[PDB]
């Protein structure tokens, strides 16, 4: 446990120091459909010819990454994702690049985004939200022990697997840092106030992000919302939050301790660290070892109609991968 | 209700990250 992370941090350090490269090639896979589109690329369901396995391929257009000045962030994403190993973190299977793009082939989580189920059902009950929250708690403890800050927690980045457990995806803003960083990045509704105020920040922002997640899951809507981000920012730094009348007092107390503007008082960032969170009353019935071992029975199991089934993902406009005859930005992505 | 106001807002769909 306190020594489980010992071994863990050892495997990470080797892969962090000397990262894997070019472990596959584009012609080994048959592209099937888009699962999710994004800023500089997309994610498609692909099928590995030699094994018959399905995977999720993230495709990043090098030229676009450079234009939006996300070179460092992108290298971070791959370097970290290939080195981490946790039951609730998506597994990176292969990575490679070509003249035009960067590719990351991960395990395929068929259950879809937590976001989709959350918006469809409306909100989750407390024990259901607790189930998911417990998983993030252990993942952040794992990640922070390796000096990594996540910075992008949100239902859109959480996928439900065949067992009903969650897999954290998208390490676009993940970063290994000892001390504090200054990048304004993340998603508006989940940004901690110290990010907005440009004060320089640390791992505490992730615990803030957790308070927002738990709030959204249970309420069905985020604590701070409005039509325009700037309006959202204004709300966050005020810290003034109201709770649905159906929230248990135990939940309200945990959220007041996570959604605390004063880092000096924010749970997770205190002398007891994560334990202030793990020992909270709302988590009294939660058996952490059973969660980690994934033996607890998930409260929600997505419908699965065989592998390669994308029923749990909305549809998107298909595009054809374009590969130039000329190498683009080769020197910038040398380490990828 | 708060829910009513949220559902009427323009940020009910998938939320994109910011880079700044
Ligand atoms: N391993 C995966 N399995 C299934 N779907 C995935 C996987 N990874 C990503 N996706 C889908 O693609 C979407 C975008 O992936 P993401 O990494 O967040 O891309 P981006 O950096 O462009 O936002 C996700 O929200 C999810 O719907
Ligand atoms: Sr994303
Ligand atoms: Sr991203």
Distance CA A92, CA A169 (A): 10
- The coordinates were experimentally obtained by X-ray
Classified as helix, coil or strand, A254 is: helix
Q: Where are the alpha helices (DSSP H) in A146-240?
A: 193-196, 204-219, 229-238
Q: What does each C-alpha distance from A44 to A32, A53, A106 come to in angstroms? A: 7, 14, 10
Domain boundaries, chain A: 1-18+113-303, 19-112+304-334
Q: What are phi and psi of A313, to 5 degrees?
A: -125, 135
Tell me the pairing of strands A41-48 and A175-176. Answer: unpaired
Q: Is the Cα dihedral A24, A25, A27, A33 positive or negative?
A: positive
> CB under 8 Å to A156, separation ≥6 — which residues?
A113, A115, A187, B14, B15
Set of chain B residues whose Cβ sits within 8 Å of the Cβ of A227: 9-11
Assign domain A1-18+113-303 to its CATH superfamily: Transferase(Phosphotransferase) domain 1 (1.10.510.10)
Q: Which ligand is nearest the CA of A185, by number?
A: 3
* A58 CB near ligand 1 (under 6 Å): yes
Q: Could you tell me how many residues make up chain B? A: 20
**In 3D, which of A168, A98, A181, A110 has the Cα closest to residue A136?**
A168
Q: Answer whether A319's CB lies under 8 Å from A42's CB.
A: yes
Chain pair A-B, CB pairs under 8 angstroms: 52
Q: What angle do CA A156, A161, A162 make, to 5 degrees?
A: 150
> How buried is residue A39: exposed, middle or buried, by Cβ count under 10 Å (0-12/13-18/19+)?
middle
> CB under 8 Å to A130, separation ≥6 — which residues?
A282, A283, A285, A286
Nearest CA-CA distance, residue A279 and chain B, Å:
31
Structural resolution in Å: 2.0
Classified as helix, coil or strand, A232 is: helix
Distance CA A155, CA A187 (A): 11
Reply yes or no on whether A262 is catalytic: no
Q: What are phi and psi of A97, to 5 degrees?
A: -150, 170
Top-level class of domain A19-112+304-334: alpha beta
Q: First vs last Cα of chain A: how many Å apart?
A: 33
């Amino acid at each position: 446990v306190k020594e489980f992370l010992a071994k863990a941090k050892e495997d990470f350090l080797k892969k962090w120091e000397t990262p894997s490269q070019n472990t596959a090639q584009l012609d080994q896979f048959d592209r099937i459909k888009t699962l999710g589109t994004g800023s500089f690329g997309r994610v498609m369901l692909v099928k590995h010819k030699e094994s018959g396995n399905h995977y999720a391929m993230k495709i990043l257009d090098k030229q676009k990454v450079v234009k939006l000045k996300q070179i460092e962030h992108t290298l971070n994403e791959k370097r970290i994702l290939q080195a981490v190993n946790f039951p609730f973190l998506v597994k990176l299977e292969f990575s490679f690049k070509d003249n035009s793009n960067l590719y990351m082939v991960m395990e395929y989580v068929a259950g879809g985004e937590m976001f989709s189920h959350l918006r469809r059902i409306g909100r989750f009950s407390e024990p259901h939200a607790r189930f998911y929250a417990a998983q993030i708690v252990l993942t952040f403890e794992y990640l922070h022990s390796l000096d990594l800050i996540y910075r992008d927690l949100k239902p859109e980045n959480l996928l439900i697997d065949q067992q009903g457990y969650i897999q954290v995806t998208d390490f676009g803003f993940a970063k290994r840092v000892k001390g504090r960083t200054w990048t304004l990045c993340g998603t508006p509704e989940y940004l901690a106030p110290e990010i907005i105020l440009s004060k320089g920040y640390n791992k505490a922002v992730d615990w803030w992000a957790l308070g927002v997640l738990i709030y959204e899951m249970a309420a069905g809507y985020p604590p701070f919302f409005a039509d325009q981000p700037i309006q959202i920012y204004e709300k966050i730094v005020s810290g003034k939050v109201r709770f649905p009348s159906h929230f248990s007092s135990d939940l309200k107390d945990l959220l007041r301790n996570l959604l605390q503007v004063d880092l000096t008082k924010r749970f997770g960032n205190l002398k007891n660290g994560v334990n202030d969170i793990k020992n909270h009353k709302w988590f009294a019935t939660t058996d952490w070892i059973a969660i980690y071992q994934r033996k607890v029975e998930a409260p929600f199991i997505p419908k699965f109609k065989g592998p390669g089934d994308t029923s749990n993902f909305d549809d998107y406009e298909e595009e054809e991968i374009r590969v130039s005859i000329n190498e683009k930005c080769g020197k910038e992505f040398t380490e990828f | 209700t708060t829910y009513a106001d949220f559902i009427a807002s323009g940020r009910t769909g998938r939320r994109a990250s910011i880079h700044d």
